[PDB]
Every structure is written in structure tokens, then in C-alpha cells.
Design an enzyme around this catalytic site. Structure first.
Site, PDB file in Angstrom:
ATOM      1  N   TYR A 165      18.559   8.971  36.550  1.00 55.15           N
ATOM      2  CA  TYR A 165      18.874  10.343  36.198  1.00 55.15           C
ATOM      3  C   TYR A 165      18.734  10.551  34.695  1.00 55.15           C
ATOM      4  CZ  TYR A 165      21.975  14.541  36.809  1.00 55.15           C
ATOM      5  OH  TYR A 165      22.545  15.803  36.983  1.00 55.15           O
ATOM      6  N   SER A 187      19.241   2.353  38.562  1.00 54.45           N
ATOM      7  CA  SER A 187      20.393   3.230  38.750  1.00 54.45           C
ATOM      8  C   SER A 187      20.204   4.098  39.994  1.00 54.45           C
ATOM      9  CB  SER A 187      20.710   3.994  37.443  1.00 54.45           C
ATOM     10  OG  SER A 187      22.066   4.373  37.364  1.00 54.45           O
ATOM     11  N   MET A 188      20.157   5.416  39.842  1.00 50.86           N
ATOM     12  CA  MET A 188      19.916   6.292  40.994  1.00 50.86           C
ATOM     13  C   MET A 188      18.544   5.998  41.612  1.00 50.86           C
ATOM     14  SD  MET A 188      21.760   9.976  40.367  1.00 50.86           S
ATOM     15  CE  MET A 188      23.527  10.169  40.581  1.00 50.86           C
ATOM     16  N   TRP A 238      22.890   2.537  41.682  1.00 52.09           N
ATOM     17  CA  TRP A 238      23.981   3.467  41.900  1.00 52.09           C
ATOM     18  C   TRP A 238      23.643   4.353  43.088  1.00 52.09           C
ATOM     19  CZ3 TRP A 238      28.603   4.928  39.308  1.00 52.09           C
ATOM     20  CH2 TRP A 238      29.170   6.119  39.766  1.00 52.09           C
ATOM     21  N   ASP A 267      28.143  -2.774  32.065  1.00 55.72           N
ATOM     22  CA  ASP A 267      27.684  -1.465  32.504  1.00 55.72           C
ATOM     23  C   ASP A 267      28.892  -0.540  32.697  1.00 55.72           C
ATOM     24  OD1 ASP A 267      26.485   0.724  33.901  1.00 55.72           O
ATOM     25  OD2 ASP A 267      25.015  -0.657  34.853  1.00 55.72           O
ATOM     26  N   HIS A 313      24.071  -0.664  30.638  1.00 59.18           N
ATOM     27  CA  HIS A 313      23.414  -0.095  31.808  1.00 59.18           C
ATOM     28  C   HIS A 313      21.884  -0.163  31.729  1.00 59.18           C
ATOM     29  CE1 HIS A 313      23.030   2.502  35.267  1.00 59.18           C
ATOM     30  NE2 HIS A 313      22.445   3.488  34.538  1.00 59.18           N
TER      31      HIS A 313
END
Ligand code: K
Length: 262
Positions: free
Chosen positions: A58, A131-132, A156, A177, A208
Site C-alpha cells: 500500500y 505487505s498487502m 499483511w 516491523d 518493515h
């Protein structure tokens, strides 16, 4: 059912900036179902190779994950790095777009005007993301169990239950993170999967972005991601030790693996 390309591997060859193949790239003129893409491919791999689609997180763009493109392609893969339709897209959307990117690579493999005409074995595909984009990758794997491998970093999602995933999955986590903490994100995601080969590698002190372009542990992270893809995408058991082993690194502060056969 193996697809062995390139010199027999060594730790040093896996830790280098590139593998044995020259890499070229092109921008996709008319991206189908995603925002933008860059296709990286080996000029002379010596046989068909699998394809891998990589999705950022994101607010992020291709630059965040771009290093994986040449790193993997230079070992014998066609790799597409994408920008999403919006930087603000969520994991389900990211998954759809990742799979659209694979689809378009597969289609271009059959298109005479493409530089990757006939380069790809479209039965051997893999997913990656941050992540996303990592949550997206695992949704892609849940929905498309014919995928051969997943390699995700700092994943995530709004749910951590990936119990239906049967695809070999490597997760890089970042110790410090604060966006997608290990104990509430990466490790619950890892722990939800019981039906697959899987691995978890936590980078000491990592923020992260610890697996992103510009990271200082690329030798190890690149080795592990290439080795995982070679083992599972290609069924190349020359890569079994590299794929399954604990790194034995002061850079690594936790290491877990299950169902990776030597
Ligand atoms: K279609």
C-alpha cells in the site's frame, strides 16, 4: 518432472548480484487488469522457464520490489513487477491484479510479437509480494493451488487464516516491523498453514522494508528466494539444501520450516 537449468548451484552463485543469465526487460504497453508492469527475462536460459508476478504494498510502486526482477530472471525465470491500479488497493484486489499480470505474461508467451514468445512454461508459475502484496500473494495461492510457489515479505492481511494454502510458501519477516508485526501478522500467517512446504526467516533488526530494494541483507534474502523458486517452481532438487536449510547467519533472528524434504 524436473526442469533443471543453469550451472549446479553454489551459495556464492546464489548470493551474487546475478545468476548465470543475461537479463533484458520491457514495459508492458497495454497492461491488462493492473496499473503498469515491467517484464524481466533471461536472454538464453536454455529451456522454458516459469513466470513470477510481484506486487508491492500500500502506497508503494515497482521500485520497492524491483530488485527481485533481475535477481530472479538471471537465474532462469520470467518476472513481472507491477504497479497496482491504485496505490490504495487492498489485498483481494492486489491478488486479482497479480493473477492478471501472470495471465498477461502467459498470453504474451503465445504472442509472436513479444520478446518473451515461447520463453515461458505457463504450467509453472509463482507469486511474490510485500505487505498487502504479500497478503495478496497468499490469497492468490489459496485460490489457485496449481501455483508452484509463493515468496512473500512482511505479509499483511485483514485475516491471518491461510489454512487452505497448499502451495510451497516462504515468508521473510522483519524483526522490528511496526507496520505488520511478526507476532500478529507474519507468524500467525505462517502458523495457519499445515498442508504445505513452508519456511519463515526473520531478519534481525529489520524494519518493515527489510526485504525491499536497497536492503543490506540481499545476498541472503536473494539466495533464499531464488533457491525456493528453483526448488519448487522447477522441481529442481539440486536446490533442496539451499531451500530447506537454516542460514546460520547472525543476520537471522528466527528460522522455522516445515515439510521441506531433503
Ligand atoms: K482469462
Amino acid at each position: 518432472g524436473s526442469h533443471m537449468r543453469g550451472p549446479n548451484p553454489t551459495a556464492a552463485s546464489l548470493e551474487a548480484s546475478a545468476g548465470p543469465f543475461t537479463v533484458r526487460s520491457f514495459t508492458v504497453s497495454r497492461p491488462s487488469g493492473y496499473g503498469a508492469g515491467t517484464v524481466y527475462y533471461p536472454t538464453n536460459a536454455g529451456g522454458t522457464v516459469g513466470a513470477i508476478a510481484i506486487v508491492p504494498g500500500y502506497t508503494a510502486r515497482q521500485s520497492s520490489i524491483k530488485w527481485w526482477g533481475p535477481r530472479l530472471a538471471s537465474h532462469g525465470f520470467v518476472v513481472i513487477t507491477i504497479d497496482t491500479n491504485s496505490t490504495l488497493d487492498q489485498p483481494e484486489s492486489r491478488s486479482s491484479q497479480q493473477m492478471a499480470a501472470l495471465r498477461q505474461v502467459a498470453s504474451l508467451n503465445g504472442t509472436s510479437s513479444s520478446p518473451i514468445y515461447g520463453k515461458v512454461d505457463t504450467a509453472r508459475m509463482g507469486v511474490m509480494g510485500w505487505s498487502m502484496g504479500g497478503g495478496g500473494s497468499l490469497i492468490s495461492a489459496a485460490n489457485n493451488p496449481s501455483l508452484k510457489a509463493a515468496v512473500v515479505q512482511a505479509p499483511w492481511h485483514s485475516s491471518t487464516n491461510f489454512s487452505s494454502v497448499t502451495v510451497p510458501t516462504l515468508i521473510f519477516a522483519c524483526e522490528n516491523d511496526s507496520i505488520a508485526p511478526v507476532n500478529s501478522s507474519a507468524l500467525p500467517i505462517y502458523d495457519s498453514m499445515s498442508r504445505n512446504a513452508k519456511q519463515f526467516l526473520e531478519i534481525c533488526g529489520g524494519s518493515h522494508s527489510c526485504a525491499n530494494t536497497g536492503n543490506s541483507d540481499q545476498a541472503l534474502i536473494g539466495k533464499k528466494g531464488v533457491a525456493w523458486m528453483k526448488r519448487f517452481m522447477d522441481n529442481d532438487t539440486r536446490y533442496s539444501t539451499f531451500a530447506c536449510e537454516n542460514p546460520n547467519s547472525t543476520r537471522v533472528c528466527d528460522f522455522r520450516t516445515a515439510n521441506c524434504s531433503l
